[PDB]
């Protein structure tokens, strides 16, 4: 079979709502890869490629964003099996997700959080550009290429095609979901994304997410548990405005005073990762 011969399976890296993910190598050129299995019965959202073939939405979305270079994990190949689909994905090495990174480091220095957050913004802009809404932005779905200091977005399994009309479905992470989802089961793509970016930024500079319960999300009152500059607090509170239309655009986020003078990825690595 074209799967078992082209790739050499290694250790299981993780398992969960996303399926089972294995470390692996492409046998030809020894490129490191990740091998992700999803059972068909466990798949909720289906999509279709330009031709007839019906695939997981995730494959559709990944092909739309996997063109060229970016802060998005590249889809190298996919295979269909009788009861599952198998995805072949890029694997940086060495690598660590941002969740684990924050677990080990605690709250991030603002200089480091600025660099990370900037790269997340460019990746998300890229997705929206390609007509893709990720819908599950959070520290676990962000990989750090430790050598290069480059961040990479992963797991489009809760994603959707970007549209200008309302969304009434959501299967991403609840504590990163906006108050309009909690209260009305309605949200629009960009402003729901910006809310989750606000959660992420708080997570980075405080070492934990700001809200646990539905009622806290709805109240939208932000308490800073760690020392954070006034400019950073302001950006966070702006992303977390209760009224969707009160939140910044990607452009306003990147023109914010706190976002100025970002480090390059490589110097971020030299100063903070090496």
Ligand X SMILES: FC(F)(F)Oc1cccc(-n2nnc3ccc(NCC4CCNCC4)nc32)c1
Q: How far apart are CA 159 and CA 133, in angstroms?
A: 6
Q: Does 95 bind ligand X (CB under 6 A)?
A: yes
Phi, psi of 168 (to 5 degrees): -125, 5
> Does 208 qualify as catalytic in the annotation?
no
Question: Ramachandran region of residue 15, left (φ > 0), alpha (ψ -120 to 50) or beta?
Answer: beta
Q: Does 145 bind ligand X (CB under 6 A)?
A: no
Binding-site member from 37, 64, 91, 138 for ligand X (CB under 6 A): 91
Binding-site member from 102, 137, 143, 160 for ligand X (CB under 6 A): 143
On whether 14 is known to bind a ligand per the annotation, the reply is: yes
On whether 111 is known to bind a ligand per the annotation, the reply is: no
Binding-site member from 155, 180, 182, 211 for ligand X (CB under 6 A): 155
- Which of 238, 235, 162, 174 minimizes the C-alpha distance to 204? 235
Measured from the CB atom, the residue of 140 and 214 that comes closer to ligand X is 140
Strand order in the sheet with 142-145: 95-97, 142-145, 150-153
Q: Does 187 bind ligand X (CB under 6 A)?
A: no
- Do the beta carbons of residue 57 and residue 159 sit within 8 Å? yes
How far are the Cα atoms of 2, 67, 153, 270 from residue 71, in angstroms, in the given order?
29, 11, 6, 19
Measured from the CB atom, the residue of 52 and 94 that comes closer to ligand X is 94
Residue labelled with tokens 């939208």? 220
Q: How many residues bind ligand X (CB under 6 A)?
A: 17
Chain residues that interact with ligand X, rule: CB under 6 A: 13-14, 18, 21, 23, 34, 36, 73, 89-91, 95, 97, 140, 143, 154-155
Annotation: binding site for ATP: 13-21, 36, 90, 97
């Amino acid at each position: 079979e074209p799967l078992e011969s082209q790739y050499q399976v290694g250790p299981l890296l993780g398992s969960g709502g996303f399926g089972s993910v294995y470390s692996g190598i492409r046998v030809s050129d020894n490129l490191p890869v990740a091998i992700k299995h999803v059972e068909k019965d466990r798949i909720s959202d289906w999509g279709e490629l330009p031709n007839g073939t019906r695939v997981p939405m995730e494959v559709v979305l990944l092909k739309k964003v996997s063109s060229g270079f970016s802060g998005v994990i590249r889809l190298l190949d996919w295979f269909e099996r009788p009861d599952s689909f198998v995805l072949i994905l890029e694997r940086p090495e060495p690598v660590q997700d941002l969740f684990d990174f924050i677990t080990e480091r605690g709250a991030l220095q603002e200089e480091l959080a600025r660099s990370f957050f900037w790269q997340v913004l460019e990746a998300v802009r890229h997705c929206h550009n390609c007509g893709v809404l990720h819908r599950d932005i959070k520290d676990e779905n962000i990989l750090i290429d430790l050598n290069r200091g480059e961040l990479k977005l992963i797991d489009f399994g809760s994603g959707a095609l970007l549209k200008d009309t309302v969304y009434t479905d959501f299967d991403g992470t609840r504590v990163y979901s906006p108050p309009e989802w909690i209260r009305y089961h309605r949200y629009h793509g960009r402003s729901a994304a910006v809310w989750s970016l606000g959660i992420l930024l708080y997570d980075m500079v405080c070492g934990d997410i700001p809200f646990e319960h539905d009622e806290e999300i709805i109240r939208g009152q932000v308490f800073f548990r760690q020392r954070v500059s006034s400019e950073c607090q302001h950006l966070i509170r702006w992303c977390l405005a209760l009224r969707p239309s009160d939140r910044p655009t990607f452009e306003e986020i990147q023109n914010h005073p706190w976002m100025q003078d970002v480090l390059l990825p490589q110097e971020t690595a030299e100063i903070h990762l090496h």
